[PDB]
């Protein structure tokens, strides 16, 4: 698709057989998802820092599908103010900025 | 320009005869520039929230160039971890999510 930025760019998620909303943001170098019960082993991840860091776990090559595009790849569960598709899902799906 | 997401989206910006470097934040609705002494009237915003809000100044109708795309905008003054182009200003170079 092409996503045009009058409103804030807001997709449906598929993940864990759960359908979620999730902002797509550039801002972000990785994805963040509220508590969800991704299966198997992770690792302990720092995210944030400014006043502080907040303890995530990183899940890897997790499957996801973003707008109807299955892919692969890395994602940090635990606390946001919201569900965040960062630049490591975007390079996945193809999503590119353009002017 | 098609700009891929494998780095963070810094872009080289014109404002007040001033070269400056700033992201491309899709997660942003506003843009937000570090202090910069633009001329004329502005009036008080408060953005952030989270813990407080951050005053800044508004300025309106204020022209700006980004990757040598010449726009007219509201940009956003003060305090800000790095400069920022927002929702806003990517609607006025006409730059859009694309996969």
């Given at each position: 698709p092409q996503?045009?930025?009058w409103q804030r760019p807001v997709v449906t998620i598929k993940?864990?057989?759960?359908?979620?909303?999730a902002l797509?943001?550039?801002?972000?170098?990785?994805?963040?998802?509220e508590e969800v019960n991704?299966?198997?082993?992770?690792?302990?991840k720092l995210i944030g820092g400014?006043?502080?860091?907040?303890?995530?776990?990183?899940?890897?090559?997790?499957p996801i599908e973003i707008?109807?595009?299955?892919v692969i790849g890395t994602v940090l569960v635990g606390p946001t103010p919201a569900n965040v598709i960062?630049?490591?899902?975007?390079?996945?799906?193809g999503c590119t900025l353009n002017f």
């Amino acid at each position: 698709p092409q996503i045009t930025l009058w409103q804030r760019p807001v997709v449906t998620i598929k993940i864990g057989g759960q359908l979620k909303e999730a902002l797509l943001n550039t801002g972000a170098d990785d994805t963040v998802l509220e508590e969800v019960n991704l299966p198997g082993r992770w690792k302990p991840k720092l995210i944030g820092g400014i006043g502080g860091f907040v303890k995530v776990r990183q899940y890897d090559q997790v499957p996801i599908e973003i707008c109807g595009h299955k892919v692969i790849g890395t994602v940090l569960v635990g606390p946001t103010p919201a569900n965040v598709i960062g630049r490591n899902l975007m390079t996945q799906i193809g999503c590119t900025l353009n002017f």
